Design a protein around this ligand. Sequence first.
Ligand SMILES: Nc1ccn([C@H]2C[C@H](O)[C@@H](COP(=O)(O)O)O2)c(=O)n1
Ligand SMILES: Nc1ccn([C@H]2C[C@H](O)[C@@H](COP(=O)(O)O)O2)c(=O)n1
Ligand SMILES: [Ca+2]
Ligand SMILES: [Ca+2]
Ligand SMILES: [Zn+2]
Ligand SMILES: [Zn+2]
Ligand SMILES: [Zn+2]
Ligand SMILES: [Zn+2]
Lengths: 524, 524
Amino acid sequence: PWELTILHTNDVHSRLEQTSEDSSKCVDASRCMGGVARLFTKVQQIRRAEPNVLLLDAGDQYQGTIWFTVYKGAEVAHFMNALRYDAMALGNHEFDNGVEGLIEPLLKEAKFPILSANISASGPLASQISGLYLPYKVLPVGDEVVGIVGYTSKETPFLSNPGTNLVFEDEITALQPEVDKLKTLNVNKIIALGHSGFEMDKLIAQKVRGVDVVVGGHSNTFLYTGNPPSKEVPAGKYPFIVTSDDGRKVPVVQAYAFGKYLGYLKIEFDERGNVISSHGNPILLDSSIPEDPSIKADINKWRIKLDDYSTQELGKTIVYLDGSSQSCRFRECNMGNLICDAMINNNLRHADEMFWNHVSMCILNGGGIRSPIDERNDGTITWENLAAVLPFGGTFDLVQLKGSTLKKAFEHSVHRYGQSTGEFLQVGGIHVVYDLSRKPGDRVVKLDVLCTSCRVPSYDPLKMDEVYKVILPNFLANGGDGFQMIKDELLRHDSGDQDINVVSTYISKMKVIYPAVEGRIKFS
Amino acid sequence: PWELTILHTNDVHSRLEQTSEDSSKCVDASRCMGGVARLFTKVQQIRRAEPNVLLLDAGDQYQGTIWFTVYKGAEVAHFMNALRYDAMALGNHEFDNGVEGLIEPLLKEAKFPILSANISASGPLASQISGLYLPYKVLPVGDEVVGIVGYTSKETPFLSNPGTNLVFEDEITALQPEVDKLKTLNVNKIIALGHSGFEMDKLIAQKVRGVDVVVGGHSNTFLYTGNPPSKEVPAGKYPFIVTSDDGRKVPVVQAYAFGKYLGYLKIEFDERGNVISSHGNPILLDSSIPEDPSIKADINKWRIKLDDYSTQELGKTIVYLDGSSQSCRFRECNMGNLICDAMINNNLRHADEMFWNHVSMCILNGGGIRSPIDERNDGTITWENLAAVLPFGGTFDLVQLKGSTLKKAFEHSVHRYGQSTGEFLQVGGIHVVYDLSRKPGDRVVKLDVLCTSCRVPSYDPLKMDEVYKVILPNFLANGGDGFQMIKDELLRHDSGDQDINVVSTYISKMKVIYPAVEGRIKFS
Ligand SMILES: Nc1ccn([C@H]2C[C@H](O)[C@@H](COP(=O)(O)O)O2)c(=O)n1
Ligand SMILES: Nc1ccn([C@H]2C[C@H](O)[C@@H](COP(=O)(O)O)O2)c(=O)n1
Ligand SMILES: [Ca+2]
Ligand SMILES: [Ca+2]
Ligand SMILES: [Zn+2]
Ligand SMILES: [Zn+2]
Ligand SMILES: [Zn+2]
Ligand SMILES: [Zn+2]
């Protein structure tokens, strides 16, 4: 029996440095986790001990911290090269800076094959990108070979910025011919590595004949066999076993997100590339594992430009930006307005005759706003100032909510109004009126929202059964601040850019900002 | 007796081409007027016939049409050089593009002296600008000499962009020492040429001993002796005679604006530079005077880059920009909102602890809006598209209005509502509610306006006695659309940038716009 050890990461999302336990800035070293230096240590230990090792990444290295802001994927090529990744599948966020922002920093600099079988190019882009990513790669491992076939979420054109000369085909339709092609090269050991989410990964396991193992991403899925080592709650066993339509047992794995774990799966194969068995579990990269000193020092050197950048002027405010709790927890505050205006301004997508913009509405819990910004420093705003206001390392995500759900959110906003609790909502694209003299749960007396299906944006009454796209913090999408109805009733949830990045981009675009308190929220 | 003929222009405001009768785009050639080609013809005729001629400009060549937008004052140097101006005084608008935007295009390229006695520099600017403008110049004319001393409105730092290293001193205080200095050079014939307005010009005539003639600007003053040749109504005789405190008769002249007239004054001087008499009148530059073919052809060559520029993308809209009369004459329309947002965004001036911005409020008569803009041309907006919306060649000006006046304007807005008349107001920085069921004159039921003296902008009720700064079309400032109360009751009026330029600058800044109908105007 020939044994393969698959080490794998997915949705690292620019967590090049070690993080806190919930994947934000590392504050208390003794409780910090992940980062590429620690991952280096663990990979190097395993590669010392085990004969046949592949280190794979299932996409979404791009986007998530100031690393990506400053280095735009050059940090991904550099550190992935240093860790000697064996292959990577493209994810949705690898198109965030467009095709050009993928070809250069990543495709041209990676020292390992980057894979996707279901993306095809045309127009002049076809010539520019030809051969710079591949449907599959056959890799020598020990004395054997392993084929790896890649795939990328077919939703990518709605989520990111691939442009109009890339077509994203159905994953299963695209993969089958490639796997058939591998069979014809006498490749009998096949990994599907790709970035479409656990539910798609299971379908690939079931339906794509010849696939031996699926290594996936995109859904931040945590799989574990046994007691969970940290706070993530498993979505299922590791590996998750799919019974394929050809009656094989196909293991499916993922390793959460943010570089906190190193996926580790051992597969025993017989002479004909059939899986005898497979077992393993993600490894929690906690502080018991030392950060490799060399990679740490290189990280520290790369961090000099980030620190520099963090204190430069992004743009100016001519107004005090009132992020005080005494305002933002009690009434409309102009810092809430700025953040929402920035959320809506980020990622505009228009379709003639269809929508002026795909999203028009924003909500933001006042407790998420953690500082004002003073305008009397020559009006300068820096990334560091924005980090005081938004210090949690979160994202601004897009969800789809029924009107009824959002009406419940706005009742929750004021259900125990007056105690300075964090749940009071700042808004954009929404005009709400409350009457606090009404019973809790019945205080929203007017709730109008900006149309999307219109050529001229205007405000209409919220409709209980209609589904609205809303940008809001990942904190709220996950039901924080007691917004359980959002978590439980949302119909879709896509993760977006890092919170600070969204606001900094808007400020840099606008050059000079002056958000006002203008009657988005009123009390009768 | 030695006779001097002073030809003079002021406040030409970028009217390099011939104009209509009210100084807008020339449509019907047979009724077009001014422009530098026609002015060339007239100046050349007078210089053939009269021995001792100076051609002077009293400032504000900068700003007013796409000429200045594209060529940024290089068109001023070029054409003023071609006409062989003898001297020019700096006006307020010559600082519109900052000190750098004056030094280069104009100061370094003019082939005539540029004058101002009351502007002084310090810091590193003092070294950069030293000698590039002068307090005075002594010019040979025939066998004699004439001293010309310049001055510039002391209000310039509030009106334009001179920066903090220029100090603008009181005009009379500054001029006296210079005129004293000219006396000590045996210069007995002295013209004060400068840019502070007719009322200041009269005070200079009265108070600055040794000044023989004042040639002024800034107030667009039309002076005429006899029947007016066109539609401008004279503010007084030409020349206007001031009796100086030394008991001389000092003629004061101006020649309206926009290059429509050539000021022409003849002064007879005795042996000791005393004015025996003076007489003349501005010459209407109507179509009876041919445009000089050579200057016309040069104008036509310069116009190629303007036409090119006029069809380039300034930026994009993702919304239909509803400038239809059926909207903008009846209710809030998003094109009205865009224009007002652009008016407020233009010329931000902040003072810590004093005001977030000097102005927060805009009104715009719906009849001034003359086209929508369709977003389905790839969202592109061009200068040509903006010229369909704003075709009158007007400016967006700043006035100071009491609350009572503005409440009267808003009653006028709806006094005969429902007939699609042009006076209905689009707004910015104002939340108005009307109740059309009330009697005319009593229909405004709520009128809230954005504070200026505040660090966080918010809306407060309008106060009848308080004075508000409002940006609005020069059309309205002059009482158009029956807004007689604005003309009659305003406390101050400063003329700003060309209407199209203001909107194009904003669109270029924003890159992608999406103005909404959002409840700035409501009906109860
Ligand atoms: N990642 C996080 C963590 C906390 N919060 C918010 C929830 C509460 O509104 C506030 C913390 O409550 P308090 O400031 O009252 O301790 O922070 C947030 O928005 N995002
Ligand atoms: N320089 C000008 C000339 C006209 N108008 C406005 C006044 C009226 O609102 C409209 C002309 O009225 P109508 O379109 O009903 O003829 O144009 C303007 O705003 N500026
Ligand atoms: Ca196999
Ligand atoms: Ca004299
Ligand atoms: Zn991801
Ligand atoms: Zn993803
Ligand atoms: Zn002027
Ligand atoms: Zn002026």
